Design an enzyme around this catalytic site. Structure first.
Site, short mmCIF file in Angstrom:
data_model
loop_
_atom_site.label_atom_id
_atom_site.label_comp_id
_atom_site.label_asym_id
_atom_site.label_seq_id
_atom_site.Cartn_x
_atom_site.Cartn_y
_atom_site.Cartn_z
N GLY A 51 0.75 -1.24 0.00
CA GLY A 51 0.00 0.00 0.00
C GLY A 51 0.79 1.30 0.00
CB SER A 146 9.60 -17.44 -26.17
OG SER A 146 9.52 -17.36 -27.58
CG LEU A 194 18.48 -9.41 -15.50
CD1 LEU A 194 19.91 -9.92 -15.43
CD2 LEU A 194 18.41 -7.94 -15.12
NE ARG A 227 18.44 2.28 -9.29
CZ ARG A 227 18.46 0.95 -9.38
NH1 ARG A 227 19.59 0.32 -9.67
NH2 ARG A 227 17.35 0.25 -9.19
CG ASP A 229 17.11 -2.07 -12.99
OD1 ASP A 229 17.49 -2.44 -11.86
OD2 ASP A 229 16.68 -2.87 -13.85
CD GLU A 257 21.48 -2.99 -9.55
OE1 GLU A 257 20.92 -3.23 -10.65
OE2 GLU A 257 21.17 -3.55 -8.48
CG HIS A 327 16.81 -2.76 -4.06
ND1 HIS A 327 17.73 -1.73 -4.09
CD2 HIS A 327 16.63 -3.14 -5.35
CE1 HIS A 327 18.08 -1.49 -5.34
NE2 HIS A 327 17.43 -2.33 -6.12
CG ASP A 328 19.25 -5.77 -5.77
OD1 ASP A 328 18.21 -6.46 -5.85
OD2 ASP A 328 19.46 -4.79 -6.50
CG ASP A 371 13.77 -9.91 -3.55
OD1 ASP A 371 12.84 -9.33 -2.97
OD2 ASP A 371 13.66 -10.38 -4.71
O1 LIG Z 1 12.22 -10.24 -11.73
C1 LIG Z 1 13.61 -10.29 -11.41
C2 LIG Z 1 13.92 -9.48 -10.16
O2 LIG Z 1 14.05 -8.10 -10.58
C3 LIG Z 1 14.38 -7.18 -9.54
O3 LIG Z 1 14.46 -5.86 -10.02
C4 LIG Z 1 15.75 -5.30 -10.39
C5 LIG Z 1 16.57 -4.93 -9.16
O4 LIG Z 1 15.82 -4.10 -8.29
C6 LIG Z 1 17.81 -4.19 -9.65
O5 LIG Z 1 18.60 -3.79 -8.55
C7 LIG Z 1 18.62 -5.10 -10.59
O6 LIG Z 1 19.16 -6.17 -9.88
C8 LIG Z 1 19.82 -7.22 -10.63
C9 LIG Z 1 21.17 -6.74 -11.15
O7 LIG Z 1 21.00 -5.61 -12.00
C10 LIG Z 1 21.84 -7.87 -11.94
O8 LIG Z 1 23.13 -7.47 -12.36
C11 LIG Z 1 21.95 -9.14 -11.07
O9 LIG Z 1 22.94 -8.97 -10.10
C12 LIG Z 1 23.82 -10.10 -9.96
C13 LIG Z 1 25.14 -9.81 -10.68
O10 LIG Z 1 24.91 -9.63 -12.07
C14 LIG Z 1 26.12 -10.97 -10.48
O11 LIG Z 1 27.38 -10.64 -11.04
C15 LIG Z 1 26.28 -11.27 -8.98
O12 LIG Z 1 26.88 -10.19 -8.35
O13 LIG Z 1 25.00 -11.50 -8.36
C16 LIG Z 1 24.10 -10.38 -8.48
C17 LIG Z 1 22.85 -10.71 -7.70
O14 LIG Z 1 22.21 -9.53 -7.22
O15 LIG Z 1 20.68 -9.49 -10.51
C18 LIG Z 1 20.04 -8.45 -9.74
C19 LIG Z 1 18.76 -9.03 -9.17
O16 LIG Z 1 17.76 -9.17 -10.16
O17 LIG Z 1 17.80 -5.60 -11.68
C20 LIG Z 1 16.58 -6.26 -11.26
C21 LIG Z 1 15.85 -6.67 -12.52
O18 LIG Z 1 15.25 -5.55 -13.14
C22 LIG Z 1 13.30 -7.24 -8.44
O19 LIG Z 1 13.66 -6.38 -7.36
C23 LIG Z 1 13.13 -8.67 -7.93
O20 LIG Z 1 12.06 -8.71 -6.99
C24 LIG Z 1 12.82 -9.60 -9.10
O21 LIG Z 1 12.75 -10.94 -8.63
CA LIG Z 2 -1.96 3.32 -1.10
#
Ligand SMILES: OC[C@H]1O[C@@H](O[C@H]2[C@H](O)[C@@H](O)[C@@H](O[C@H]3[C@H](O)[C@@H](O)[C@@H](O[C@H]4[C@H](O)[C@@H](O)[C@@H](O)O[C@@H]4CO)O[C@@H]3CO)O[C@@H]2CO)[C@H](O)[C@@H](O)[C@@H]1O
Ligand SMILES: [Ca+2]
Ligand SMILES: OC[C@H]1O[C@H](O[C@H]2[C@H](O)[C@@H](O)[C@@H](O[C@H]3[C@H](O)[C@@H](O)[C@H](O)O[C@@H]3CO)O[C@@H]2CO)[C@H](O)[C@@H](O)[C@@H]1O
Ligand SMILES: OC[C@H]1O[C@H](O[C@H]2[C@H](O)[C@@H](O)[C@@H](O)O[C@@H]2CO)[C@H](O)[C@@H](O)[C@@H]1O
Ligand SMILES: OC[C@H]1O[C@H](O[C@H]2[C@H](O)[C@@H](O)[C@@H](O)O[C@@H]2CO)[C@H](O)[C@@H](O)[C@@H]1O
Ligand SMILES: OC[C@H]1O[C@H](O)[C@H](O)[C@@H](O)[C@@H]1O
Ligand SMILES: [Ca+2]
Length: 686
Positions: A51, A146, A194, A227, A229, A257, A327-328, A371
């Protein structure tokens, strides 16, 4: 206006960002709350909508929670409309509460609010001197299959209500259909999906123009920053053209990021931050801070190495957005850990170089694993926590003490557990002492600083067991005991006689675009601004005051220039290098070279007759090019930002280390499109 003004969209170094997961902050309007299986008002199911909305953010801005903390900027979830589907992953429902599953970049997410609500948010924030940064994820749309067209919303993309296309029957090629990435290589991570997210094809003109028009809309709504993504998963060349579109219209601070793990130092990461047109979230800084203050897997020597290394690897280290978690990542504060560790990591971050970002709830000692456990609803809005007071006391320093915002970083005292560093900018100084050892005090003797003779009160007021500092001549501090878990901040501010540049932004744009040069000692009367050897004065310097200069980029040839200024008296400042003057508006063009055979270790690069292609200098050649996904070796490809409508001559190079082999024959030639994208395919000439 001064460099610290809320209107300064090009500089966030004097600010402190508060990262908000909109849905998990405050539900100020229950009426827009999702319903049914997509909602959980109790926020017990961290995968559904709770919410939280923009009206809630407005309320917290107006009731003083953020302002009383010293927060001067907020970074919110992507505002665009996301899919409404409730995706079931292994018997568990998931929603787009996070805002990363866009379906229309030109409309708002109804759960957060309407366009009107967004406008009220911008207005409410600015009224309290708070800048607004929005998350923007142009890498993909949403989860799609797909093989299963009925899954989710098939990643369908809309243009302000008008359907452009979905992942299935994508005859327009709006998306990539190269399966999913296994993160084995950068190219693999860029041209493949991704996870299950429909990967947008930025080489498609419709997608290119659309996304750029979309960001324009948000810029028109008054956002102060962006920011980006998953920037490691989009063509670096296209992102440069994207940043050019932003900067050549309405430039705003932008950081992307690029996730880095513990001990991971990436040269590509550095190059991207130095040449893309945007800075990055400082994961190198974050991971090291966690190693030293949270997980005890490295000491202060490792922290020092990170500070010195990063200051050298990043051309503009002061544009990197620092943090201790997000958040990650698992929440920095472990449920059973001593709270002083988080408090110290906060104090360190708030007084270190770059742009500090605080993940919402950090000040309430929220704990949680990966997460979605790190995205719970903020439990309280209490101003009585020690962490809240730490931020309250240190955050404002980035505004009043330019040494914190723009200063260099120098180690003044160090051992396994203690680090005393000094930030210095002009006649401004800040010294921070940190003893991560929670059980053992440290005898600090022989400490030398740039602090003028006198006594200094701990800015933290002993909140973290800091102490008073007594400085004699030569900046020599009297011996003192640094308490266990002790953290103290001592500072001095004064006027700076000589012009000193502390920040410039944007760092990439075409002639005619206005840039912002911030610092101290510029004086009140208009002086001179230099782009390389070229002098600019008079009218083109739109405005000039002691801390900020607004000047239009002169019509000089595209290239890399050093920026310097001189006051009315003619006294020159320090040089702020690496400013890229573009050759004009930018378009993303894919270059493909056929049958360019190489030996292992040797790669193909692109060189050309414009600065965007390095002006025939092999050292500034574009690449290494790719040869696995879209095209396969001996064919190479790469997406490059080039000046729109210009006739460009180019050639390809094979490089092993810095040793180069030039393509033979005459230069290739083509004319870049006026807008949209294009693909230039030629053969390697022996
Ligand atoms: O539906 C999928 C997922 O998406 C998430 O949303 C985004 C997230 O908020 C954003 O920070 C980013 O996170 C991803 C990284 O961009 C991506 O590089 C990857 O990170 C990995 C590295 O690449 C690896 O080298 C190693 O370090 O491990 C990392 C793990 O974090 O994955 C990240 C996580 O998805 O992109 C996301 C996708 O848009 C949502 O927040 C989440 O709830 C969803 O499940
Ligand atoms: Ca609301
Ligand atoms: O330096 C600016 C010029 O850069 C480019 O020229 C390249 C040639 O394309 C490349 O073939 C190679 O030329 C060498 C030539 O093959 C060899 O016989 C001769 O002995 O040396 C030449 C180099 O000195 O390297 C040059 C770069 O040095 C570009 O094609 C051209 O338009 C630019 O003016
Ligand atoms: O006094 C100058 C000197 O101060 C610091 O040295 C510290 C050192 O870091 C401590 O670990 C311990 O050995 O005490 C020394 C001072 O007596 C600076 O680190 C050093 O570079 C500087 O020269
Ligand atoms: O794909 C990345 C890879 O490309 C090049 O490797 C070539 C190799 O040079 C050829 O001789 C042949 O083996 O095909 C390879 C690509 O599949 C680069 O030389 C290499 O460094 C790079 O990693
Ligand atoms: O190992 C995965 C992660 O574990 C912990 O969360 C550490 O704090 C973090 O630095 C690391 O990346
Ligand atoms: Ca991608």
């Amino acid at each position: 206006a001064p460099d610290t003004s809320v209107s300064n969209k090009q500089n966030f170094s004097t600010d402190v960002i508060y990262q908000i997961f909109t849905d998990r902050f405050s539900d100020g309007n229950p009426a827009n709350n999702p319903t049914g299986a997509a909602f959980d008002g109790t926020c017990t199911n961290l995968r559904l909508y709770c919410g939280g909305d923009w009206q809630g953010i407005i309320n917290k801005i107006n009731d003083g929670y953020l302002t009383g903390m010293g927060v001067t900027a907020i970074w919110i979830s992507q505002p665009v409309e996301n899919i409404y589907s409730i995706i079931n992953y292994s018997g568990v429902n998931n929603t787009a509460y996070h805002g990363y599953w866009a379906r229309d970049f030109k409309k708002t997410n109804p759960a957060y609010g309407t366009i009107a609500d967004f406008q009220n948010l911008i207005a409410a924030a600015h009224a309290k001197n708070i800048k607004v940064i929005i998350d923007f994820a142009p890498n993909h749309t949403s989860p799609a299959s797909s093989d299963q067209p009925s899954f989710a919303e098939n990643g369908r993309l809309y243009d302000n209500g008008t359907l452009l296309g979905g992942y299935t029957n994508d005859t327009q090629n709006l998306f990539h259909h190269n399966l999913g990435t296994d993160f084995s290589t950068t190219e693999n991570g860029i041209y493949k999906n991704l996870y299950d997210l429909a990967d947008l094809n930025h080489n498609n003109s419709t997608v290119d123009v659309y996304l750029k028009d979309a960001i324009k809309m948000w810029l028109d709504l008054g956002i102060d920053g962006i920011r980006m993504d998953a920037v490691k998963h989009m063509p670096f060349g296209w992102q440069k053209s994207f940043m050019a579109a932003v900067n050549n219209y309405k430039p705003v601070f932008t950081f992307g990021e690029w996730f880095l793990g513990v001990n991971e130092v990436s040269p590509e990461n550095h190059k991207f931050a130095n040449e893309s047109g945007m800075s990055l979230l400082d994961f190198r800084f974050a991971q090291k801070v966690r190693q030293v203050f949270r997980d005890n897997t490295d000491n202060m020597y490792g922290l020092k190495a990170m500070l010195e290394g990063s200051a050298a690897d990043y051309a503009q280290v002061d544009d990197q957005v620092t943090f201790i978690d997000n958040h990650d990542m698992e929440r920095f504060h472990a449920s059973n850990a001593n709270r002083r560790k988080l408090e110290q990591a906060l104090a360190f971050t708030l007084t270190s170089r770059g742009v500090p970002a605080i993940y919402y709830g950090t000040e309430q000692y929220m704990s949680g694993g990966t997460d979605p456990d790190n995205r719970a609803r903020i439990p309280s809005f209490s101003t009585s926590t020690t962490a809240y007071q730490v931020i309250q006391k240190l955050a404002p320093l980035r505004k009043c003490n330019p040494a914190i915002a723009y200063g260099s970083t120098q180690e003044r005292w160090i051992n396994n557990d203690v680090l005393i560093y000094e930030r210095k900018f002009g006649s401004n100084v800040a010294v921070v002492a940190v003893n991560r050892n929670l059980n053992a005090p440290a005898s600090i003797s022989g400490l030398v600083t740039s602090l003028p003779q006198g006594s200094y009160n701990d800015v933290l007021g002993g909140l973290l067991n800091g102490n008073t500092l007594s400085v004699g001549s030569g900046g020599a501090a009297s011996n003192f005991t640094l308490a266990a878990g002790g953290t103290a901040v001592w500072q001095y501010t004064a006027a700076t006689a000589t012009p000193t540049i502390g920040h410039v932004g944007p760092m990439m744009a075409k002639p005619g675009v206005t840039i912002t040069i911030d610092g101290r000692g510029f004086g009140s009367s208009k002086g001179t601004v230099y782009f390389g050897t070229t002098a600019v004065s008079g009218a083109d310097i739109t405005s000039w005051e002691d801390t900020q200069i607004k000047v239009k980029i002169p019509a000089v040839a595209g290239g890399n220039y050093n920026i310097k200024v001189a006051n009315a008296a003619g006294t020159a400042s320090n040089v702020y290098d690496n400013f890229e003057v573009l050759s004009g508006d930018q378009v993303s063009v894919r270059f493909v070279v056929n049958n360019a055979t190489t030996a292992l270790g040797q790669n193909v690069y692109l060189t050309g007759s414009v600065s965007e292609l390095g002006n025939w200098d092999p050292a500034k050649a574009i690449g290494p090019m790719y040869n696995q996904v879209v095209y396969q070796y001996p064919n190479w490809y790469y997406d490059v930002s080039v000046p729109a409508g210009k006739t460009i001559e180019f050639k390809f190079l094979k490089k092993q280390g810095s040793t180069v082999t030039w393509e033979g024959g005459s230069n290739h030639t083509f004319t870049a499109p006026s807008s949209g994208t294009a693909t230039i395919n030629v053969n390697w000439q022996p």
